[PDB]
Amino acid sequence: GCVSNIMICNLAYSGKLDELKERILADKSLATRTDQDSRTALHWACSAGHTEIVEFLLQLGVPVNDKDDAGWSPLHIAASAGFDEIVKALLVKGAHVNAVNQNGCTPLHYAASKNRHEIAVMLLEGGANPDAKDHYDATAMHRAAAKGNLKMVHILLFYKASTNIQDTEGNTPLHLACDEERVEEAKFLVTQGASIYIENKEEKTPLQVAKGGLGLILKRLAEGEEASM
Amino acid sequence: MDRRQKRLIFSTITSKMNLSEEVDLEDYVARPDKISGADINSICQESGMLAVRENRYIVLAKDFEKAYKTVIK
Secondary structure, eight states: OOOSSSHHHHHHHHTOHHHHHHHHHHOGGGGGOOOTTSOOHHHHHHHHTOHHHHHHHHHHTOOSOOOOTTSOOHHHHHHHHTOHHHHHHHHHTTOOTTOOOTTSOOHHHHHHHTTOHHHHHHHHHTTOOTTOOOTTSOOHHHHHHHHTOHHHHHHHHHTTOOSOOOOTTSOOHHHHHHHTTOHHHHHHHHHTTOOSOOOOTTSOOHHHHSOHHHHHHHHHHHHHHHHOO | OOHHHHHHHHHHHHTTSOBOTTOOTHHHHTSSOOOOHHHHHHHHHHHHHGGGTSOOSSBOHHHHHHHHHHHOO
């Protein structure tokens, strides 16, 4: 193991809860020292999924919103890693749902990207902004649509995420779904308002991006929606 | 190259790398940089090699953002 220059953070990552308890209770200041990457024992326990070490640190009242030097908060780390129980304990203690890291991502970007449905819901229920944009103006839906995470796209739409935000290459989630052949995602999106008209930076709409079978289907769906609704 | 291919290359190689449970390769896969599959095996080999200058035996998010910014330009 041995991921940090600070030994109490290695105990946190290692899951050595009893040793970690004995050292911190001997000198409580140790629970919040930051290591060379500006992580504390809380970041590392989240990173390794040791729920019990997280509960001991939150029981002591340590800060739950501090970021490491790449701007990752304990909530980002747990949400991307898929710690449902850790995510949940963090939120109960006030973790900031819209915190952003150095790539401009919120924890929902990572939950959406990695198909963490239950965590995405906890986040959105906790007030996360579905429309947060990262440093390339990409949203959680760009991630989910690109990757083919259909149910994640359903959950985002349910919390009212916008479907027509353009990243810096001018792509909406629909262009990404078309580009990677995410057929059901593309269809669901058009059925919920994604426009088949928006052009990205290369002057292409999602239809010009799509293979022809898909483009025909989306076209049809788009005229369906423009006729009714 | 192709976003989909790019992601396939990243995931296939890091598949026998041990990465921390929070790393998400999409943050790099989604960048608008045209890079080859050589460049990717490259970021990936550099990341594991740097597992060693701060010296952690598991590969972390920071190993990548480094590898990535050095390798691409």
